[PDB]
Design an enzyme around this catalytic site. Structure first.
Site, short mmCIF file in Angstrom:
data_model
loop_
_atom_site.label_atom_id
_atom_site.label_comp_id
_atom_site.label_asym_id
_atom_site.label_seq_id
_atom_site.Cartn_x
_atom_site.Cartn_y
_atom_site.Cartn_z
N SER A 115 4.22 -5.93 3.26
CA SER A 115 2.90 -6.02 3.87
C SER A 115 1.90 -6.69 2.94
CB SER A 115 2.39 -4.64 4.29
OG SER A 115 1.12 -4.74 4.90
N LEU A 116 1.17 -5.94 2.14
CA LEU A 116 0.24 -6.51 1.20
C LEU A 116 0.93 -7.32 0.10
CD1 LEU A 116 -1.38 -5.92 -1.83
CD2 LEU A 116 -2.66 -6.81 0.13
N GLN A 151 0.83 -1.20 0.00
CA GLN A 151 0.00 0.00 0.00
C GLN A 151 0.87 1.25 0.00
OE1 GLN A 151 -3.47 -0.37 2.27
NE2 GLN A 151 -3.89 1.83 2.46
N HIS A 157 -0.04 -2.01 11.66
CA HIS A 157 1.17 -2.67 12.14
C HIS A 157 1.60 -2.13 13.50
CE1 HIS A 157 1.66 -4.51 8.13
NE2 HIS A 157 1.37 -3.31 7.65
N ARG A 179 -8.92 -9.07 4.37
CA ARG A 179 -7.89 -8.23 4.99
C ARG A 179 -8.18 -6.75 4.75
NH1 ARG A 179 -2.72 -6.43 4.02
NH2 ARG A 179 -1.21 -6.63 5.74
N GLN A 226 1.47 -10.65 11.33
CA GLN A 226 2.11 -9.59 10.55
C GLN A 226 1.28 -8.31 10.57
OE1 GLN A 226 2.12 -7.87 6.91
NE2 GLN A 226 1.87 -9.77 5.75
#
Length: 282
Positions: free
Chosen positions: A86-87, A9, A191, A111, A239
């Protein structure tokens, strides 16, 4: 040795992957059916400005990342390692055969929903200071509700947490020498300790899925080390609420002998971070 980097992202943009959707017709129509809307119209036109909101962002990045990997697979030699921010970590697992196209798209869909419904907290991108100074500055200034969101490069750290502390830290951070303190346009604190309710929800959601062992190694965001087939599930849950250790993952791949770092997706965000990480490592 070669590695593929999948962006996350913040690297999406209007018009991304316009040439991929035509090259992969069937895959695009399949994505249309799982999402309930035209993925093509979203990426190319940004109909009513929905690309900036995570629940539509993450699916859009998953498809573009996935179609780019299939185009590079029929034009290049296979890669030796895979990694995603991340993604992107879901695109790296799809490329390793841990799950197929439309299974990974379902997880990312959920998600995006859990991260969309999250409220409270903010983020800031810090350039110019190392992690040890960032920690020292949150201790010095009584910022007790801020966590490290990700470690992108030696001089780039993102913090996330309480909104009121993200805002008042700008002045001391810039006084300490921060090149840039940017409060990120974001809905929640990703996060960090504030994503734990979504982490528990995403944990029970992932109970109904099995994950096959990778065929190409995937360096995890949680450990900066290759994933374990037995630990994939537990790692995709944790995560969400723990820091992304990008700088460490790139350094691990360098230690293994990885020579070529290729960004597989739209943009060149991870290429910029790699250039910084490589300057400090070599």
């Amino acid at each position: 040795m070669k590695a593929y980097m999948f962006p996350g992202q913040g690297s999406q943009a209007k018009g991304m992957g316009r040439a991929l959707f035509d090259a992969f017709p069937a895959l695009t129509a399949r994505a249309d059916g799982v999402l309930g809307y035209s993925i093509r119209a979203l990426c190319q036109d940004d109909p009513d400005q929905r690309l900036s909101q995570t629940q539509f962002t993450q699916p859009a990045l998953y498809v573009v990342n996935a179609l780019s990997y299939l185009k590079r697979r029929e034009e290049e030699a296979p890669p030796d390692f895979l990694a995603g921010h991340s993604l992107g970590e879901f695109s790296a697992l799809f490329a390793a055969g841990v799950f197929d196209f439309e299974t990974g798209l379902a997880l990312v869909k959920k998600r995006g929903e859990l991260m969309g419904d999250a409220r409270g907290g903010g983020m800031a991108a810090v350039i110019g200071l190392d992690e040890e100074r960032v920690r020292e500055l949150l201790d010095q200034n009584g910022a007790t509700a801020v966590d490290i969101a990700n470690l992108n490069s030696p001089s780039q750290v993102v913090i996330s947490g309480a909104k009121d502390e993200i805002a008042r830290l700008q002045v001391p951070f810039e006084a300490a020498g921060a090149k840039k303190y940017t409060v990120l346009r974001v809905s929640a604190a990703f996060h960090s300790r504030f994503m734990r309710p979504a982490m528990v929800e995403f944990g029970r959601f992932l109970e109904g899925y099995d994950f096959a062992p990778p065929k190409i190694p995937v360096i995890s965001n949680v450990t900066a080390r290759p994933c374990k087939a037995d630990g994939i599930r537990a790692a995709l849950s944790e995560q969400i609420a723990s820091p992304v250790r990008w700088c460490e993952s790139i350094r691990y791949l360098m230690g293994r002998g990885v020579e070529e770092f290729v960004e597989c997706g739209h943009g060149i965000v991870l290429t910029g971070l790699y250039a910084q990480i490589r300057r400090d490592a070599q």
